[PDB]
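Posted in: Structural Biology > Protein-Ligand Complexes

Title: Requesting predicted complex, zinc ion in pocket

I'd be grateful if someone could produce the 3D structure tokens for the following input. Sequence and ligand are given below.
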Amino acid sequence: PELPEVETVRRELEKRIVGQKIISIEATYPRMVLTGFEQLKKELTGKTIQGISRRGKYLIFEIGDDFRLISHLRMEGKYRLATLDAPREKHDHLTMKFADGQLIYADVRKFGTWELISTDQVLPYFLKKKIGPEPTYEDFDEKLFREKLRKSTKKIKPYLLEQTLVAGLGNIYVDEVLWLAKIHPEKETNQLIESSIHLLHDSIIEILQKAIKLGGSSALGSTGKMQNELQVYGKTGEKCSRCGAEIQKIKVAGRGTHFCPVCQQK
DNA sequence: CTCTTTTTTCTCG
DNA sequence: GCGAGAAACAAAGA
Ligand SMILES: [Zn+2]
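-- Reply #1 --
Done. Output follows.
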């Protein structure tokens, strides 16, 4: 789950669970609640879900007057809305039970996290994480982006993955964006010229907007269509749609990295 | 059997 | 401060 998938889950949850009173909460893996599971159970039992927001790849449940449950799905987390009599599945860890169904969180690798904080702690929480701007025309200012790139000698793919230039890209969309903007993932950012930075900035907004519209790439979220539009990620050895070269895969700062060697000149 | 592969945040030098 | 590497964890493939 990168930002488009997290947004897809957000929208689905907004439609289905807003207004629901939480009747009980149970955990088979309480250690993934970083603020303390029994504390969360005591605070949130009986409260009503008022909204669901998102910041970068983080989901934010708005519960009761002043609670915010910040949920990160990391690599494999999945939510589903199930009947109250639904059978347990192996990697289910937490559930919020409502009167007419339950929201279950599963995560094979156990990396995902829940943290309960108050409303007035949300903005500080994200400042402390140093998360950069949302990828929208309004919030993602190209001028600061350009200045940050000009001053760094980091490589472009790992710098984009830091979430500090702009929030929301992970391995799939970083590789897709760099192919679309014709930039090689190992390019040192201080080597990018103004026109390439402008194409990169717009391509980040466009590609994530597109992915959100198509319901993300593939429980909640499972209906996505963006996977059918990927041009490079997981396409090793297939032909680039623009130039016909084979897509290559290399390792860049520990991550699998897919690119077209003609279109993305080193 | 071993090794590699698949978001965030740490240690190490 | 930096980058390289790895850990947190589970499972599948070679
Ligand atoms: Zn190409």
